[PDB]
Amino acid sequence: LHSKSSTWWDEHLSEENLSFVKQLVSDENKTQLTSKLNPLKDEPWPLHPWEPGSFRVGLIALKLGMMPLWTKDGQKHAVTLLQVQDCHVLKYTPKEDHNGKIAALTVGGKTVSRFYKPDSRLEFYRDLGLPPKQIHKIFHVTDNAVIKPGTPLYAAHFRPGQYVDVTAKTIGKGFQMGNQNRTVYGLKVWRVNTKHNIIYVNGSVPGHKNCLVKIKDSTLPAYKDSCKNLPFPTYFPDGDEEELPEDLFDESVWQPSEPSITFA
Amino acid sequence: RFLSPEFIPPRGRTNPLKFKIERKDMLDRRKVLPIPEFYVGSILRVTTADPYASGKTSQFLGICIKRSGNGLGATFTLRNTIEGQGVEICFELYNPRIQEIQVVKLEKRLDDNLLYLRDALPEYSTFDVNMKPVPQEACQEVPVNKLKVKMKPKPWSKRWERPNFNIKGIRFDLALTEEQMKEAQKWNKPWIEFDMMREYDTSKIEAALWEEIEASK
Amino acid sequence: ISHGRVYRRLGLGPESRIHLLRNLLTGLVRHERIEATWARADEMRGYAEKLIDYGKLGDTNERAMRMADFWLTEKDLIPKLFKVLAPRFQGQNGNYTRMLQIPNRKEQDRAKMAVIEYKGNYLPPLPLPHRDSNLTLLNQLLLGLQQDL
Amino acid sequence: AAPKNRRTIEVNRCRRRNPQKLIKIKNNIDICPECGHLKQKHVLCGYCYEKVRQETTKIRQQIGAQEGGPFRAPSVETMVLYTGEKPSEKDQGKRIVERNIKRPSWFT
Amino acid sequence: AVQKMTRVRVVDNSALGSTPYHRPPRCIHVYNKSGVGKVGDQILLAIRGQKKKALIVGHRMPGSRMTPKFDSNNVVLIEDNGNPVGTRIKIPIPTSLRRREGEYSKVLAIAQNFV
Ligand SMILES: [Zn+2]
C-alpha cells in the first residue's frame, strides 16, 4: 500500500550498526561539549562592570535528593541536593524584541537523546553546536549581564551564604490536581560541590526527585543587590584566575572531619 | 566483617553519588569520633556535649532497643529505667555533639527490636547507669541473650502475639493461652514468608561497601 | 491511580494471586511454554527467573526445598528443577525466561495474549523477529562510514 | 428526570459523526515474510504460529503417551527426535521423544 | 502530648495532689495558642474537687531525637501568685525548661532531681 507507515530510529538499524550508532552518539555529544568548554576563547561579548539594579542569569538543575546537615552551633538542618547538568546559553533575546523593561536569555540543561525528538529541535541545536536539552527556560537578564549563546554555565555561579529562589512543577495528584509551576522563596545556600556541580539549598523544593528545577537569585527586597560581591556576569572556569576548592562551605556550616562540637 | 547498617543504602531512585559522598563524610567523621560495633540488646554509654550546660558532658547508659536510619542521618536508641522511670533516648551516630561512644556491654537479644520491653517487667529493662564495662572478645560473635521476658497484663502497646511481629523473646505461654495464639495466628499471611516481591538483595552491595570502608581507614 | 505500584492485582485476593501465580509457575515448569494474558505473564516472569536461581543454589538447601515444594504443587517436578532446569541454566547468569506478544484472542473479549517460555528448552523455536541484514543499502552506507572511521 | 423534549436527528447526527466518536484508521499493519500474511509491527505471525502450536500438541501428544501416567515428569533432560535422525552420544541420559514425521525445515 | 482528657500524675507534695482521691486529675485544655500540651506548658488541673494551675514536665508522646521519652505524664502545681503550690518535686524533671521561653526558675529550683 502507498500509505504512511510508523517508523522508529531502530527500525532499520542492524545490530552491528546499532552498537556503532550508540557509540557514535556518545562521541558526537562529547565532541560538541568539549568545543563549547571555552567561552572566553570564543569571541566573548564585551564584559561590563556591575552596577545597582543588575540581574544575573539563572541555572537549571536536577533534584538529586535531600540529606541532613549540621552547623557549628550543633543545629541540624535538612538540605536538598541540586545538580547542574550541561547548562549552556542557547538563545539571547534583545531587550526591544522581548520586553522593553529587561532583556531575556534562554538556558537549557540535562542533555537528552536525539532519537525521539523533532527535527526542528535538532536543527536549532545543530546550529548552536550543542546536543539537545530536556527543558528550555527563559531568564530575565540585564543588558550589562548578557552572555553570548553557547557559554557553559556551572554551579559555581552561586556561592555559599547566598539566598536563592527555586521554581519547579508541583507533583501531579491525578483527578480528585498538581502539575503546576510553583516557586519557593528565601532558600539559603549552604555549600556547593565544584567537582559534581552540586548546590546545597536550604529547605524543600517542589517536585519529585530527578526533576529539573529553575534556579535564580532571590528577588526579596532584603537581597536586592547580592551580586556585587559575586561573579557579575557569571563564574568562568575558562579564566581560571584562582582554582576554586572542590567543596565550598558556609562559615556557620560545620565541615565533616572537624572536631566534635562542644557547647562550651 | 561487621558492616554497620547505616552504610547500606536503601532502595530507591536517589542517585548513588549521594551515598558515595555521604559515606566519605561518614568515614572522615569516624576518624574524628570512633563508632564501636554494637547490636540491639547491647548496653551502651554515650558521651555527648550538653547544650544547656556549659563545658559539661552527658553520659547516658541503656540497653540498645532499636537501630534506624541510613547514612550520616543514622540514629540508635538505647533504653533504661532511671529513678523508676523508663526512658528512651535516640542518638544520631554522626552528630558532632556526641563526644564519645562506649559499649559498656556488647551483646545481642533474641529480637532485633526491643520495644516489647516496655510491656515486659521493669527488671528486664532496669540497668545500672554506673555499671562498669564487662569483658568482651573482639574475634568472636557478640553474646546472644536468650532469656525470655515476662509481659505485663494483656493490654499492650502492640499485638506482639500476632505472627507478623514474630517476637521470639516473649513468654506468651504464661500470659496467653494456645487458643489466643491461634486467634493471633489468623493474621499469618503464610505466603509472605514465600513472597519474593518483598526481598531486597544487598549481597553484592554489602561486599563492595566493605572494601570501600576499609580503604578509607 | 497506579503511580509507583510494583504489584498487579490479580485473582480474588493476594492469596489468590499467589495461588494463581503458583498454578501458572507449576504449569510452565511442566510444559516449559505457556500462553497467558500479557498482564499476568509479565507479573509471573520475575518469579520464574528467581526460581531458577533457587535451583542453582543447590538441592541440599533447606529454603530451596521448601520454596520448591510450595510453588510446585506437582512433586514430580521437584527433582526436575534441580536436575533439569538448574543444570541447563548453570552457564546463564539470567534472562532464563523469554516472553513475547501473541495476537489477541478472538474470544469476544480481545484479551492481550503473550507466551512465556524457558530458554534452552527442547521445544520448537518460537518465530522470533530477525533484525535487518548489514547488506541493506542503509547498513552498507553505514559500513562505508565505519571503514572511513 | 426525563428528557424535556425529543432530541433532533441533526443534533444526534453531529454527536455520532464527531471525529472523536468515529473509528480511526491504523497504520501499524505489517506483512509476515514467513507466511506472506498481514500482521502488526508489535504482533507476531499467526499462519506460521498455527503450524508451531499444532506441532507442539503433536509433540506433546507423543510425550503424554510415552509417560503413560500423571506425576511422571522426568528428573532428566528431554529431547525430541524425528524420523531419519539417530540419537548421539550427547543425547545419552536424556528423555527421547520420537516423531514419525521428518524433521521440520523450520524446526532445527 | 497532653491533649484533652489524658489522665495525668500529680508530681507534687501539695495537699490536694498528695492526698489520694478516687477520681484521677484530668486535663481538658492547655494554656497555649495550640490545643496540644507538652513539657513546660501551663495547664489547669482539677484536683480534690478544686481547680489548680499545673506545669507539664513530662509526656508519653514520642519526642524529638536526642531527648528522653517518658512513660508517664507528670505535672507540677503552680499557684496564682506564680509560686509553685508544692515545695518539692519527686520525679526527675528535664533541664530543658530553663532555656524554654517562660518563667521556669521557680519550678526548677523546687526540682530535686534533674535528668
Ligand atoms: Zn508466517
From Swiss-Prot, chain A:
Q: Could you name the domain of life of the organism this protein comes from?
A: Eukaryota
Where is this gene product found? Mitochondrion
What does the similarity note say? Belongs to the universal ribosomal protein uL3 family.
Q: Relate the assembly described in the record.
A: Component of the mitochondrial ribosome large subunit (39S) which comprises a 16S rRNA and about 50 distinct proteins.
Q: Which GO terms describe its molecular function?
A: structural constituent of ribosome
Supply the source organism for this entry: Mus musculus (Mouse)
What is the protein's name according to its record?
Large ribosomal subunit protein uL3m
UniProt xrefs under Pfam families:
Ribosomal_L3 (PF00297)
- For this UniProt entry, what's an example GO CC term? mitochondrial inner membrane
- What PROSITE patterns does this protein map onto? RIBOSOMAL_L3
Task: State the Gene Ontology BP annotations.
Answer: mitochondrial translation; translation
- What is the residue range of the signal peptide feature? none
List UniProt keywords, sorted A-Z. Answer: Mitochondrion, Ribonucleoprotein, Ribosomal protein, Transit peptide
From Swiss-Prot, chain C:
Q: What is its main location?
A: mitochondrion
Task: Enumerate the transmembrane spans.
Answer: none
Q: Name one GO molecular function term.
A: protein domain specific binding
Q: Report the subcellular localization.
A: Mitochondrion
Is Membrane one of the keywords UniProt gives this record?
Answer: no
> Which GO cellular component terms, listed alphabetically, does the Swiss-Prot or TrEMBL entry include?
mitochondrial inner membrane; mitochondrial large ribosomal subunit; mitochondrion
Q: Which family does it belong to?
A: Belongs to the bacterial ribosomal protein bL17 family.
Q: How does it assemble?
A: Component of the mitochondrial ribosome large subunit (39S) which comprises a 16S rRNA and about 50 distinct proteins.
How is this protein named in the record? Answer: Large ribosomal subunit protein bL17m
Q: Which residues of the full protein are shown?
A: 9 to 157 of 176
Curated annotation (Swiss-Prot), chain D:
Please describe the post-translational modifications of this protein.
Answer: MRPL32 precursor is processed by the m-AAA protease (composed of AFG3L2 and SPG7), which cleaves the N-terminal transit peptide. Cleavage by the m-AAA protease takes place prior to assembly into the large subunit, an essential step for mitochondrial ribosome (mitoribosome) assembly. Proper processing by the m-AAA protease is dependent on the zinc-binding region within the tightly folded C-terminal domain of MRPL32: zinc-dependent folding halts degradation initiated from the N-terminus and triggers the release of mature MRPL32.
Highest taxon of the source? Answer: Eukaryota
Q: Name one GO cellular component term.
A: mitochondrial inner membrane
Keyword list, A-Z = Metal-binding, Mitochondrion, Ribonucleoprotein, Ribosomal protein, Transit peptide, Zinc
User: Which GO BP terms sit in this record?
Assistant: mitochondrial translation; translation
Does the record's keyword annotation contain rRNA-binding?
Answer: no
Which residues are noted in the entry as Zn(2+)-binding?
Answer: C32, C35, C45, C48
The places in or outside the cell where this protein is found are:
Mitochondrion
MF terms from GO for this chain are: metal ion binding; structural constituent of ribosome
UniProt function note: Component of the mitochondrial large ribosomal subunit (mt-LSU). The mitochondrial ribosome (mitoribosome) is a large ribonucleoprotein complex responsible for the synthesis of proteins inside mitochondria.
Similarity section:
Belongs to the bacterial ribosomal protein bL32 family.
Q: How does it assemble?
A: Component of the mitochondrial ribosome large subunit (39S) which comprises a 16S rRNA and about 50 distinct proteins.
Q: Protein name, please? A: Large ribosomal subunit protein bL32m
Q: Which residues of the full protein are shown?
A: 78 to 185 of 187
UniProtKB/Swiss-Prot annotation, chain E:
**Top-level taxon in the UniProt lineage:** Eukaryota
**What is the name attached to this protein's record?**
Large ribosomal subunit protein uL14m
Its function? May form part of 2 intersubunit bridges in the assembled ribosome. Upon binding to MALSU1, intersubunit bridge formation is blocked, preventing ribosome formation and repressing translation.
Which family does this protein fall into?
Belongs to the universal ribosomal protein uL14 family.
Q: Where in the cell is it found?
A: Mitochondrion
Q: What species does this protein belong to?
A: Mus musculus
* MF-aspect GO terms: structural constituent of ribosome
Lineage, please? Eukaryota, Metazoa, Chordata, Craniata, Vertebrata
Say which residues of the entire protein are included here: 31 to 145 of 145
Complex formation: Component of the mitochondrial ribosome large subunit (39S) which comprises a 16S rRNA and about 50 distinct proteins. Interacts with MALSU1.
Q: Is the keyword Zinc in the record?
A: no
